[PDB]
Design a protein around this ligand. Structure first.
Ligand SMILES: O=C(O)c1ccc(O)cc1O
Ligand SMILES: O=C(O)c1ccc(O)cc1O
Ligand SMILES: [Cl-]
Ligand SMILES: [Zn+2]
Ligand SMILES: [Zn+2]
Ligand SMILES: [Zn+2]
Ligand SMILES: [Zn+2]
Lengths: 314, 313, 312, 313
């Protein structure tokens, strides 16, 4: 029945795509108490436009809203414009800032459009980067946790070469990833998670038979984490520990380790959470669907599920 | 409750887009009796794929299906491929042929993707063209009737320049449009419709103060239609006769005459019917939404409304 | 307060409902508002109307200029050449007062075509009458319909589609927009968002459905933007109207503009725009059958006053 | 040294001369002074301006907050809805920074009314904009002109004389004085000697030339003295200005205040919009689109505005 148990910022994404409309449909389906926990970031004009089209004007009065990504002309649904690109980023930036300040506890971004953003002259390569930039952090102090099919997997490294990732790995980097992911687990409604750390090398180096990295990196880090009072197994061969399927959070050393399981088991319904400082940002997992914008064919299921995920009860 | 009272062919459109998905969601909402009146044309594989995503396997057994637009390799949701273009057209072609043969009474096409069809090497300019080709007809024996907000408007011309349209207009062309649209009215559940013919010129030439075209074209055509026993008023200024809102079918000379009223009053309740021989094909009036395809977020409302429209006695 | 500039009100056919509705509309305004509206017509018709409606004391507070004086008593309902001449004389004096700058716009109460024709006067609409009075070509006067929030100016009107197409030029489109933009200021939208309709369906769709748009509407839009106007198009009229997000639409052809307006509004106001003069009709007939029983509705007049009287 | 407090500088229309004069003014200050002025506007406009004015070295040590970001490159001299939005976004961020206490006053560089109108934003002056932003009634925000030693706050502005007279109340005069007295502190006159103008000639001369003064200015003066303020009047505006012994005059009507200021300072007046704790001043010249890009605009009026709002005590 009730899926929102905390304060959330909802950025409406590209004001020309389906974001505004699915934002309205999602809020519609919530109770009044739930609506008052969701603060919406975007141009009012886009939500007004969307509301006209969907015949949901009565909903706009009950909306907590902060203007962001104001446009200089009316909304043109379905058009890829530099303006809507700037809007998108301005909206997500204001949502993120509200999370950073403590006004909300997590962020959801509705679908952007990469081309719209590029044509505005703005570099954008994903939510992990955007979040890093906005919070004044290096991109490797923001981590991606994939969630799907009961698996939660945080990545100690991400979009770089295997060699570069290996060169970056340190006991402290693993610890930062776990800390950030454990906090995120609390949000997702698992206060005391059972954690498994993947091995850098096959079979977690098998002692030191298949490299020194694990004895230098994952083994010390696990020890420090146990000492701080966490329930951590490993390191263990990723293949082996995932198979057991008895942990609430897995810690993957490399992109592929985490991404393969998630995409294989949850190919149509996974959430990608960017975690940095106190900020948890998730997307909706789908594009802006320009050709159906304002055409009343998009439903809010994926958004609602994302809300359910970040909005779970302690 | 129930909206399907006749036999319908449902072509699932681009097997990579949202067509399969919305096909399943629409059929879900119907009773078993209603499901058995909709025969589905498309690759089984795409419906299987869609069923996985929506968790609606239980529905596939109760589905009247004819394989069409088979794919030789798996469904890849969200990709624009020549293969999915050919599939689209093959499915719609099989649905159309089923209507032509009398196996069904009308066709609904789920959303195509123009680029997918173009990349297959197939010329495509709309359902009117496709229907013409398939039924062995010239393009100006197939007419577009828009439906929404109580308005039904058939177009004597469509998708050409005003000049070109005027050069084409003849008493006979107007007659063919009305005939086709009158038959279609029976399908839509209005046996004996009251017809209003738009004037070519403002105020239907206004006693020929504003051109001779109406006296050459619309006036003779109206006469012939009355003589054949039809209830036809006009020609009349389109602006004037639409305002009265007391006709079951309007006959527009030019695209804009028909399209403006429909889209102004119903910008997302518009059905576009291609009418040729005994075949009525309606689209769903939205794209294939590649960005959400296989993401389980697609609404079947527009399809359901199309079904309600073609489905009444 | 609905009257925020000076208006000339021509009472139209002195035998129809015009005088009567002129009085009833002024009645409903404050005294301040009454003094902004100067009335053009035969005093005798206003006196007649006032007697019937029992509104004599309102005639004293009226700014009036005699025009279209009658030679005999008022005969309500009756079509006479005299009432035809009166009509035209009244509207001519209202127009001239606008042209001179004495008022800021004109409202004409309902005429009667037959009355005017029987007087020997050629008359084909307010566009014509305005053109002839101001010494202009009839193709420099444009009609803008206003109703249900829609404002639509017509680049052509009241000729065959073929004839209209033969006339259309980049310059003619530009004149229509200019005239309509100025008019928008009066209506209380100084800097409007403009949509230009395509000549051909889908505005020719590049050049796939004719060359007209690439030759006519496309250059004209590119002059208008350059001069600093907020103009979208050309676009398929059907598409752009549907969105209902522009303050002024520019129609190439009568039907394009007239269908939307008449479908959404049972009334509409029709503004004839020429030079600096905006003349609006009251959008209904002279209603000869109900003239002078003191039962006539001034609502349409009041709405026309509200429209042309709007705040900057 | 002319900057003795923290100031927000909104760079106005990013397409006009605002960014350019912003740079030239900051150039003329010491480094210490520069660090007291926080600049609000699109970085891209400042980058453009820096190229033109050959002041790249100034950009790195500049206190800047991005505001009114553009979605496309800067086009000097062009009136665009985008630059209109930028203007207002920048001024809104400067105002918000003053409201929060981050700065002590705001200077707005020249806007362009047409650019703002074309963006769909209602704009009738800085008084309006400030009212909207601060969640205040538009008639709780007052304009004070400053020039040639005259400071004059206006109880009304920018409406018909009749309309102004209909609005005047004891309370409105009181609000004007209060707002202006606070502003006086900023300008470096903590405890000013105030003169209230009469509505009517000779302040009505008792009641001989109208009742308004006895009903409006006389009670208001009484209440202000009672609250502990040093206030003379009401007196004929012509008479009290002549005495030239007050630190602040209170005008009932636009022309009462505007005539003296513009006669004595026809080129060098500052217009301060005063609302809540926010003081916003314009630069009192336009955006000069004709010369934007050409690096030939004088920053004197800006520097003078800075000197005024940046004053010592
Ligand atoms: O590889 C991906 O699918 C991917 C996409 C987006 C993102 O933030 C992180 C990812 O690993
Ligand atoms: O009328 C003016 O001179 C004027 C100009 C700018 C401003 O902000 C306020 C004003 O009264
Ligand atoms: Cl037409
Ligand atoms: Zn990746
Ligand atoms: Zn079309
Ligand atoms: Zn007409
Ligand atoms: Zn002024």
């Amino acid at each position: 029945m009730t899926i929102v148990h905390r304060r959330l910022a909802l950025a409406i994404g590209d004001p020309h795509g389906i974001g505004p409309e699915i934002a309205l449909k999602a809020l519609q389906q919530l109770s009044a108490t739930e609506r008052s926990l969701i603060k919406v970031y975007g141009p009012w004009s886009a939500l007004e436009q969307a509301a006209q089209i969907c015949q949901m004007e009565s909903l706009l009065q009950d909306l907590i809203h902060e203007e962001a990504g104001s446009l200089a002309q009316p909304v043109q649904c379905g058009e890829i414009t530099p303006q809507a690109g700037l809007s998108t980023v301005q909206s997500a930036t204001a949502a993120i800032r509200a999370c950073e300040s403590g006004e909300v506890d997590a962020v959801i971004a509705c679908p952007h459009h990469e081309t719209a953003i590029h044509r505005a002259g703005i570099a954008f390569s994903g939510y992990p980067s955007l979040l890093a930039n906005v919070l004044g952090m290096n991109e490797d102090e923001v981590f991606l946790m994939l969630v799907g099919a009961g698996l939660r997997i945080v990545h100690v490294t991400l979009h770089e070469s295997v060699r570069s990732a290996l060169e970056r790995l340190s006991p402290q980097l693993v610890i930062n990833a776990v800390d950030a992911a454990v906090q995120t687990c609390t949000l997702l409604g698992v206060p005391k998670p059972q954690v498994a750390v993947f091995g850098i090398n096959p079979h977690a180096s098998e002692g030191q038979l298949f490299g020194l990295e694990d004895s230098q990196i994952t083994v010390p880090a696990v020890e420090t984490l146990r000492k701080r009072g966490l329930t951590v197994d490993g390191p263990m061969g990723a293949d082996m520990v995932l198979a057991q399927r008895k942990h609430d959070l897995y810690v993957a050393m490399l992109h592929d380790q985490g991404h393969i399981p998630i995409k294989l088991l949850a190919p149509n319904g996974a959430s990608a959470l960017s975690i940095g400082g106190r900020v948890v940002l998730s997307s909706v997992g789908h594009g802006s669907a320009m050709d159906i914008a304002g055409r009343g064919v998009a439903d809010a299921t994926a958004l609602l599920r994302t809300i359910a995920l970040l909005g779970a009860q302690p």
